[PDB]
Amino acid sequence: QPGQFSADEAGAQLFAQSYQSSAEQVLFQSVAASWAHDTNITAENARRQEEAALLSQEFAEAWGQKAKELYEPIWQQFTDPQLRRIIGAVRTLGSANLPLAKRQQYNALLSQMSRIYSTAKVCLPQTCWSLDPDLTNILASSRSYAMLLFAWEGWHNAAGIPLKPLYEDFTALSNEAYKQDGFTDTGAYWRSWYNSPTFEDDLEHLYQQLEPLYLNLHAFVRRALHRRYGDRYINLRGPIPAHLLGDMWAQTWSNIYDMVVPFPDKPNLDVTSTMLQQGWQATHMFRVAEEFFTSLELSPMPPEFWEGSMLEKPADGREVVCHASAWDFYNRKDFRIKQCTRVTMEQLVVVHHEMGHIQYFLQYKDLPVSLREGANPGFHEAIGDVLALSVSTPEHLHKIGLLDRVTNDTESDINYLLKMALDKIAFLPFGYLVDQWRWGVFSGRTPPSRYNFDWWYLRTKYQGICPPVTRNETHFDAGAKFHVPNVTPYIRYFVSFVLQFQFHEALCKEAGYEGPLHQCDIYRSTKAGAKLRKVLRAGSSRPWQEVLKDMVGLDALDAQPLLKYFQLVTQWLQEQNQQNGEVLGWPEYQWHPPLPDNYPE
Ligand SMILES: *[C@@H]1O[C@H](CO)[C@@H](O[C@@H]2O[C@H](CO)[C@@H](O)[C@H](O)[C@H]2NC(C)=O)[C@H](O)[C@H]1NC(C)=O
Ligand SMILES: *[C@@H]1O[C@H](CO[C@@H]2O[C@@H](C)[C@@H](O)[C@@H](O)[C@@H]2O)[C@@H](O)[C@H](O)[C@H]1NC(C)=O
Ligand SMILES: [Ca+2]
Ligand SMILES: [Cl-]
Ligand SMILES: [Zn+2]
């Protein structure tokens, strides 16, 4: 239960300490119980994950209503701006304002929407495929239009449809809750984490500068799809069917790199085989990564990291979650990683990314728990990726003894950037739109009667894609993407994509590097590390604009560092598109591809 504190700013400082102190114990339980589950999926452990979660709601309610009984009408016009937000957070009760039975209704909807997603199956005319790895693989590897069309249509129908009636009731209750906290809708509350009165306009001006890069990549890749699939399925002036980009959601188009290779005569960069020959196992891949940070004079992994982490899939027939993730137990003691690591090149990069999340934790663990977060929701993924921007370059792989010779031809530099663009450039329109759709549902502009209409309106407006089958309003294609039924903000991922290349430009300049930006490697740069150490140890204890300015010199998001990065492959794509007489964009916006002859037979 909460304590007894005064109703002024000087006593608020006391209400924080006791609150921050008790939050450790409660926060630690919620992370410890999820760990005992995600590394050992048993029903009994899943039931402990819920008890620890409900125990957190009780803590946030009790300490939130207390905060609201004391300082509610006098915390806004406060002295210390750090306290202005700490108590501002505590007073926000979200679902605790709802009546008791609805609070139950709110949670049950979260529980059912997540489960409905994980257990959605695509059964055949016979056995049934699942999202991971069955359907994911098909969408990446298969090159039969009719096949890809079956996985795409089957999954969206399976996952989307049953989620719509639940999502409506969730939106209705999510908004009732956060209005009692002073917000027009949940969206306004989400968007308030960035403290930017012109946030949505700043995001549109960002993408307006980025759109030329995607329209070029769009046409270039659309021509590649025209050769493989023909004219009956690829309109050179219309949208691209949404199942021919190697990804279920077209987020990234990296699994169709074998179709768009600028120069296939040059060898693909893949040091995976070399790693196996030198005897690298998972544990060594992390020791290598740990050394990347210590070269920057950053913190090494503490003993608890090695003791507790899960660096390999367990051998004792334990059901685990294999997706790589980094865990902060909010006790300044236990930091771990759970990853079914595999001795591959991509995994080596992933291990550095996930270790960035750790280095972040370690650097700000001396702050109050409320400030053990990134500067804004889009920082963690920006720190993990900016590191991977150095570790993925052949320059670095050569220095850690994984690439004997470093080629210098520009043709190979175009293949590297193109492979990058299929991840960093193709995702921008998607990371931008996902929350735009939710912002519309939360505000009301997108009532349940127009879930799929506004969904595909955005998908066609930004990604330049279209459904390969006809869709009406019984379908809820927005729910077929994990982050929707699981209620996970998405605009942060569009932000980190912009942020990282800002972090990269700065860290490379600080390291003294000169030359093509994509060939930069901050490895063994102690001046680059000190710059990171400033950002990482700040957490959220300062405005993210300040931190970014101290690090990058600019107090806002700027897409120019990203454009400068892809400067070479951008010009090369404009030349290819003009030699082909391409039409950037999709003027024939009403176009949809016909069904394959006698489908799905
Ligand atoms: C995975 O979770 C299960 C619980 O669902 C663990 O099984 C328990 O383990 C403790 C520790 O030895 C025993 O005292 C309990 O009797 C076990 N309960 C059941 C129902 O078997 C299991 O140990 C966990 N995995 C690992 C590797 O410890
Ligand atoms: C909505 O769609 C349902 C599924 O049928 C598929 O979509 C329609 C639009 C056609 O393209 C059809 O060839 C597809 O197989 C229909 O069963 C339903 O009647 C449609 N209309 C509604 C729900 O009002
Ligand atoms: Ca991801
Ligand atoms: Cl966010
Ligand atoms: Zn990450």
Author numbering: 6 to 131, 135 to 609
Reproduce, without paraphrasing, sentences from the article in which this PDB structure was first reported.
Angiotensin‐1‐converting enzyme (ACE) is a key enzyme in the renin–angiotensin–aldosterone and kinin systems where it cleaves angiotensin I and bradykinin peptides, respectively. However, ACE also participates in numerous other physiological functions, can hydrolyse many peptide substrates and has various exo‐ and endopeptidase activities. ACE achieves this complexity by containing two homologous catalytic domains (N‐ and C‐domains), which exhibit different substrate specificities. Analysis of these structures provides important insights into how structural features of the ACE domains are able to accommodate the wide variety of substrates and allow different peptidase activities.
An open S2_S′‐mutant N‐domain structure (2.80 Å) includes mutated residues in the S2 and S′ subsites that effect ligand binding, but are distal to the binding site.
